[PDB]
Nucleic acid binder design. Structure first.
Lengths: 124, 258, 187, 142
RNA sequence: UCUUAAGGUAGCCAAAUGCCUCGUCAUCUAAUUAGUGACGCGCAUGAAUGGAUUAACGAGAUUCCCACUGUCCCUAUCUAC
RNA sequence: UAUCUGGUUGAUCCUGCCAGUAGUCAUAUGCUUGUCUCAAAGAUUAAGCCAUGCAUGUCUAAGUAUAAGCAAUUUAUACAGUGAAACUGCGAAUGGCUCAUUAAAUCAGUUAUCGUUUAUUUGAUAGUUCCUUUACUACAUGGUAUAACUGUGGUAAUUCUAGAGCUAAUACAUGCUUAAAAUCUCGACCCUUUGGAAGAGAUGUAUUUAUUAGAUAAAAAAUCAAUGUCUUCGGACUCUUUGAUGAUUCAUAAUAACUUUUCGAAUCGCAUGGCCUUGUGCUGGCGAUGGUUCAUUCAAAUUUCUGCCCUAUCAACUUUCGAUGGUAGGAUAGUGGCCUACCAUGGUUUCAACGGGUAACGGGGAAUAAGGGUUCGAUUCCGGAGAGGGAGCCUGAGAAACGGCUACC
RNA sequence: GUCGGAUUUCCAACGGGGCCUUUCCUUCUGGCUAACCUUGAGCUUGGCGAACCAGGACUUUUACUUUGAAAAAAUUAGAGUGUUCAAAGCAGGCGUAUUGCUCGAAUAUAUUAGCAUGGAAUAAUAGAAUAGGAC
RNA sequence: ACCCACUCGGCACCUUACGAGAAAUCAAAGUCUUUGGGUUCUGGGGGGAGUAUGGUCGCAAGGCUGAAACUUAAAGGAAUU
RNA sequence: CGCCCGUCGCUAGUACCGAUUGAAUGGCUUAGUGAGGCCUCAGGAUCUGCUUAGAGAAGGGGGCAACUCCAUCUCAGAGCGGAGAAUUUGGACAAACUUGGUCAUUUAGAGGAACUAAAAGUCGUAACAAGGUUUCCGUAGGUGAACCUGCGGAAGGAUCAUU
RNA sequence: AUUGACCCUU
């Protein structure tokens, strides 16, 4: 048969289904960034955890390691290019300390409201 | 079982063909010929994917059947003819000669050469023996056999062959201090400058090899292919000259000279 | 369906193996030729990749070599006298490799006569000079001369009739001859 | 192996000839060879009287491939002995080993006299028998 | 609580002991008042008037199976007296 | 992304499980379901059974066509088609499917073939036959009769097939196409010891018979049975020189015969060239298809080492007659108890042999994992095995083939 | 002093090599003369030798650990690249766009086993004892 | 034979908590989330059940080995009022 | 006036034992019978080549009427051969059945005997207090039933204690 | 010296 086309999940559900603090925080994010579901928040948390795990397994490698160097530059440059990382700090500490709110505010849906084409995030 | 295979599925073709996993569930099984199955580049893939001259196996079949492409001085109108290392693929249209040599990253790359250079080709001898009637002969990596060779030629040497007749024009011995082209393994595609070897009585000799950037590695004696003398190399090299720059260095090179 | 693989056999530990494959063509065996003497009969048998074999059945004559004299001539086989494998083959006169047979050895006698000019048992200038030069070497040993006198030389089959279709052999000389003659006389 | 010609057949090196016409010293021609890989041909194999077509040196068998060592545990078989190869098997889960052994049957030429407890090295040859695939090339115990 | 003291325990059973009875169920057969295994308000089983079991043994009684056959279908022939 | 909470009590710490909780290329099912991309899908139970249809055939300029097959031209009366059927060749041994069997078996890395076969591909490679021999035999090159096809058909029936007539070959059997140096026997010669001149038969490959070579790394004198080269016989003696492998009876070469005869082209296409004592003469190109043998490739078959789940309510197992080994032979493409004949009594095992189970094909891998692990892997790749259950075979380079045959159930 | 990329008078540590201190870089013999007694008005015509050769002496027997080739692709992590994002995929990106030019399809190997390789601490295993021990 | 001071080895005991433990308590039940001295055996919620079955030992009684189906949310320990 | 144990009674499940010299399916495995293919001993329809032979009925040159080198339909008599289908000998491979042998996995059973689960059954009161005879262990006997009793043991005792 | 028992849920 043909080669298997690879597919992967892009989100992960929370471990505890009913946490008041988590539910309130996620509803706050949904309301103030105009998101349809909590699956969007789960997806952004999934990507953030992926890149944080990459950064942590990078830091566990010694300094001047070719792998640590190259992968740090790649990850930091990608984060800077998308705009969730600072445009002046390649310390990778911020790479271990990004935020879901930063990713949401970098998303386009709020970008239209920021640049002033929307007048409301739901209009955007 | 019950007899030889004739199909070659994708994801089972050799990786150095750069064949995509989608767009078909088979790959062209290289036919029997001069080179082994794994270390061969069929004319179908060379004229369809490497050169993009033909968009279809049908177009490659038309090209081969009406005989524009001639390999090593012979037309070789086989749609999956095994063209491996050191072969010359000549196209009379546009008068272009390709030398089939690996690039730095272990892939058969395109290599434009002149007509006088495509006239000859180099071949590593695989074994020297005595055929019938007491006639000595040598066999090369290309499956070629040469009768009445120079008595000095031994195993692991290489021969510059006129490629028009069966004569061996020149030959280079395998010795320490010689510029080689490692063919296979992790180091597929490096220029050599041999330093020395470990005999390892019993099999699998390993030679130690430092490229121009003073980087030393180890390869197998059968895995190493000598392509000239220290200083000038017998043939031309593809872009990069086979030095295996590290990934960081390649990143800097790309970002500067995009 | 004579098989030749070891998968039907008990394991080296003594365990009985289970069935893994049906009998395979590439692991087959075939029946013996059981070559005999008289009215030479050869049947061709097709083997893997062509490679025909000649199953010798009832082969009449063979080619025998005297190694000391460096000669070989076609000879008739009188009969099997000893076989280290099976005495039944001796009793039946069956031709296999390493089987000792009696031969007429008349072409050997004629060759020795024309080559040395020496009588057995009881002319030109060139012939005389050749015989004189070759002489002083016709004292091989007692038993080869005795075999020549009896007219039946001992020779062992060194070929495989059921494979090559020829009962080729060589004459026993020296320690080998003494060994087999001792086996023959001891009973 | 008290006498060379005990068997019903005559034992001799195939295609090795001893011409009776010439009668000088050493009437019987014995063929030997060195097996390579640094192994030395024993004087017993050089000057012996045995035939043993399975010898590495005087026999028609050729040694190539694996080379192992072990202490023989059985000499109660004609011209073949069994060596014990003792090794440790690693188990990652428990991060330690167990003692494991493998008995490999080997053919020992009459050039070597070995007993249980001797440490012999063997080399791979073509299948000699149903189970024997190696030949003794040296002994390291006395 | 009564009759004359007790009130059939452990076991075993249509048993050589069960009338009804060719008991009922299962099995064995094409078909079984037969045999075996169960059941048990057992007319009227049962503990040295010994109960139950039991290898071995038996010219003891019974059922089935294989083998074998003139017992039979279905008779025929031969020998001696 | 190293996390817990509810439940034994009047209440408390525990143990301990139950319950919750999250995931699942884990299925099923319920209710619901608007768009885009992507996509598994009769594995589980029954490797149970199958109606019907299809899934293996094939052509070039270049192996055979006089078809009561089609469309038909002339700058040369010294020769241009497409071709259904049927021979011939090749393929049908790939693919695809499934996971029944299978527990040192398969399989995974690792080796070996100095222990083998190999269509095809690729490169190279065949001047010695006329064998009761100065001719039973054509090489400006030969026979057999066999398909298609034509008449009658035999039965209900099959991809059933007969008797007669022609006719092909790349179907089958014989058969020949040179003016090459060079050894062995047969000799008239003088009764020889440097003695040599006439002319014959064998010297291709396949002969897997016997024999020889395939050597080597260090300074003198020597009568011997037979001078070898030059040689006032009083003496100088040079020229011997053959390869690889870690390793060979290795590749090759040589010597004596055998072959019931293998091959060494009675085969096709292409516009036609040059030479002339202009003869339907001599010479000649580019190819196709065959073809010894050797390498090469695709392969195959064996094979070294190490590694597999549960079970001791499996402790001994194997061993008339194969179990372990030795000798010899048969068979194989080869090695080998693979099988025979003789002999020895060996071989495995608590470091778990042997036996049993597996709702077990193995691996790449998957799910979940702080680390360490647990569970899964019929299933897109690789390797096995099978075609309803065994078994035996033909053809073929390759099958113990099943959209091949035979037989039993 | 180099507009985050210093050839240096760095006098502080770390990791390796060489020699001597009773402490050996497994030898008996030649050629390319070799850590060479022989230098040319400044690449030596005479000893040692294993970074290479042979007949005796071996990786003192291992376990262990270091490094190296292999452990197919797909899968995994991971560089890239606006598939309109994404899962994916291995595509693509730029001209004096008449002509055309052009990058990439990398990087870890998944117990163990086998093969080489440095070490030899730790844990085993032998040597010379009625000397049939060593030079 | 006693009395003193030691010493080695025993059966123990009193005190305390460096510690340990759920606690009762423990000089070992300590040196164990700062987890590794060597080694043998045993347990994995409560029942069914030390039952059934197979094996083996025994004269027997029984011993050793030893399940599952099924069932159940507690059984249980140490303390407090 | 707590709790609580066991017979007995009722209801429903679950395994276990069980005559049937049970049954079925496979794996190997005394023997026997044994299809078919393959080798082999023969066999021989049929097809098909070679020769100095004899003629019944044509013959042609030679002085063609007392003789012929070859002969048209041609064969019945001869020998040399090649292939060779039925049939068939002995084998070797071996499918499918029987009585045996276990092994493994299923499965039918009259009946028997346990266990378990049930809001409110009967009989007693064995345990928890010194539970009113302290409990419990091993063993043995007895008994409607919990249980009682003997012998030894334990404290998990109701005693850490007699100078 | 005798002293047995006291339904289900809450």
């Amino acid at each position: 048969p043909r080669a298997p086309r690879t597919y992967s999940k892009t989100y992960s559900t929370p471990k505890r289904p009913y946490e008041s603090s988590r539910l309130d925080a996620e509803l706050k994010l949904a309301g103030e960034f105009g998101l349809k579901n909590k699956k969007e928040i789960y997806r952004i948390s999934f990507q953030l955890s992926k890149i944080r795990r990459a950064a942590r397994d990078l830091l566990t490698r010694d300094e001047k390691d070719p792998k640590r160097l190259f992968e740090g530059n790649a990850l930091i440059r990608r984060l800077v290019r998308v705009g969730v990382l600072s445009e002046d700090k390649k310390k990778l500490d911020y790479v271990l300390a990004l935020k879901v709110e930063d990713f949401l505010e970098r998303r386009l849906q709020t970008q239209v409201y920021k640049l002033g084409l929307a007048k409301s995030v739901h209009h955007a | 079982a019950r007899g030889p295979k004739k199909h070659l599925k994708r994801l089972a073709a050799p990786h150095h063909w750069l064949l995509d996993k989608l767009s078909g569930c088979y790959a062209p099984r290289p036919s029997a010929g001069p080179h082994k199955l794994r270390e061969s580049l069929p004319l179908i893939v060379f004229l369809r994917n490497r050169l993009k001259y033909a968009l279809n196996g049908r177009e490659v079949k038309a090209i081969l059947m009406q005989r524009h492409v001639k390999v090593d001085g012979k037309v070789r109108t086989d749609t999956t003819y095994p063209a491996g290392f050191m072969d010359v693929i000549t196209l009379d249209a546009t008068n272009e000669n390709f030398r089939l040599v690996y690039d730095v990253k272990g892939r058969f790359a395109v290599h434009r050469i002149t007509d006088e250079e495509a006239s000859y080709k180099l071949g590593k001898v695989k074994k020297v023996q005595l055929g019938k009637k007491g006639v000595p002969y040598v066999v090369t990596h290309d499956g070629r056999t040469i009768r009445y060779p120079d008595p000095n030629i031994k195993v692991n040497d290489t021969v510059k062959i006129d490629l028009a007749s069966g004569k061996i024009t020149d030959f280079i011995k395998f010795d320490a201090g010689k510029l080689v082209y490692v063919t296979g393994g992790r180091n597929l595609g490096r220029i050599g400058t041999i330093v020395h070897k470990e005999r390892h009585d019993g099999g699998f000799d390993l030679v130690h090899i430092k490229d121009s950037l003073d980087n030393t590695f180890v390869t197998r004696l059968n895995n190493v292919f000598v392509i000239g003398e220290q200083g000038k190399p017998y043939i031309s090299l593809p872009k990069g000259k086979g030095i295996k720059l590290s990934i960081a260095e390649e990143r800097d090179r790309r970002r500067a000279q995009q | 369906g004579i098989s030749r693989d070891s998968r039907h056999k008990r394991s080296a530990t003594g365990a009985k193996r289970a069935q893994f494959r049906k009998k395979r063509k590439f692991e087959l065996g075939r029946q013996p030729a059981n070559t005999k003497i008289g009215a030479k009969r050869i049947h061709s048998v097709r083997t893997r990749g062509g490679n025909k074999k000649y199953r010798a059945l009832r082969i009449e004559t063979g080619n025998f070599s005297w190694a000391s004299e460096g000669i070989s001539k076609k000879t008739r086989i009188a009969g099997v006298v000893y076989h280290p494998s099976n005495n039944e083959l001796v009793r039946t006169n069956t031709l296999t490799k390493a089987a000792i047979v009696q031969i007429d050895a008349t072409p050997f006698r004629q060759w020795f006569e024309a080559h040395y000019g020496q009588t057995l048992g009881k002319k030109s200038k060139n012939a005389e000079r050749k015989w004189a030069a070759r002489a002083a070497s016709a004292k091989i040993e007692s038993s080869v001369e005795s075999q020549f006198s009896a007219g039946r030389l001992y020779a062992c089959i060194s070929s495989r009739p059921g494979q090559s279709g020829r009962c080729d052999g060589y004459i026993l000389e020296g320690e080998e001859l003494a060994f087999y003659l001792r086996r023959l006389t001891a009973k | 192996e008290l006498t060379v010609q005990s068997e019903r057949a005559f034992q001799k090196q195939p295609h090795i000839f001893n011409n009776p016409k010439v009668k000088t010293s050493k009437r019987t021609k014995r063929w030997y060879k060195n097996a390579g890989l640094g192994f030395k041909t024993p004087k017993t194999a050089i000057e012996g009287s045995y035939i043993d077509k399975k010898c590495p040196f005087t026999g028609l068998v050729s040694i190539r491939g694996k080379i192992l060592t072990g202490t023989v545990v059985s000499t109660k078989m004609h011209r073949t002995i069994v060596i014990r190869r003792a090794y440790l098997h690693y188990i990652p889960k428990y991060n330690r080993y167990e003692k494991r052994h493998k008995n490999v049957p080997v053919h020992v030429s009459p050039a070597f006299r070995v007993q249980v407890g001797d440490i012999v090295t063997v080399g791979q040859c073509r299948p000699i028998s149903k189970t024997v695939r190696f030949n003794v090339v040296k002994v390291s115990a006395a």
